[PDB]
Amino acid sequence: AEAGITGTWYNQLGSTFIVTAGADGALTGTYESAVGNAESRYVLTGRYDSAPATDGSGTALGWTVAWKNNYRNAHSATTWSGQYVGGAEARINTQWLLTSGTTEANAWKSTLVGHDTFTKVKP
Amino acid sequence: AEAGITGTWYNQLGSTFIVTAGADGALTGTYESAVGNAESRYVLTGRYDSAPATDGSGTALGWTVAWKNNYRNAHSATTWSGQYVGGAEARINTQWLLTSGTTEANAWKSTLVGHDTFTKV
C-alpha cells in the first residue's frame, strides 16, 4: 500500500532515504549519507508492487542511485533490491550491488555486494 | 557426469584450476593465476554432490581458496558456487564472493561478487 512505504527511512550506518510511492508503482526520492548537509544528496528512481499478496507477505521493491550530483561524481551506481514489511515497526530489508566504471582489464572486480536494513521515522 | 570434474580447467581470464573429485564428495586441488609462474599457486578445498539427479540436471559444487601461500598473503578468501555440466563440451558455470579482511569501518565494502565459466580448453 503506497502510503506505508512513503516516508523517511534510515539504515544501520546512518544514511537517509526520503521516498514517495505513486499509485502506478513508481518510487522517487533522495538518498543521503550520515554527514547530512545538502550534498550528500542524490536522486533515486525505483518501482514497487502496488498490488501485493495479502497474508503477512512482504511487498517487493527495488531502486537505483548513480553517484553523481552537482558537487561530486564517484563514477558508480548502486541498486538495492528487497521487501517492505509493514506492522508496528515497519522495515525494508535489502541486498545491494555497487558497480564502478572500470577499464576492461579490471572489469572482473567492478562490483561490490552487501545488505541494508531501513527503519522508518516519518512519513 | 560425476568424475568428469577431475582434470584441468581454465576460466575466461587464463587462470588454471586443477581438481581431484573424491568418490564421496570431496574436492581438492590447486588454483593459479595467468603468467603461471610456480607460486601464483594456492590450495583449494570443497564439496560436490556425489549422487546427482538422473533427469538432465547439472551437478552442484563449490570450493574455497584463501589467498596465502609461501610467498604472498593477500588477506582475502574467494568461494565459488555453481554446477558442472558434462557433454561433448563440458563446463562448470559459477558465481563467486571475494571477501577481504577489513577494519569495522570498512566492513560494508569488504566483498566483491562475480561469475566465471571454466572449460577444458
Binding site: 550506518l13 549519507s33 553517484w67 564517484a74 | 565494502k109
Partner: peptide, 6 residues
C-alpha cells in the same frame, strides 16, 4: 570515501 556510507 564513497558517499553511500560513511
Amino acid at each position: 570515501c564513497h558517499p553511500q556510507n560513511t
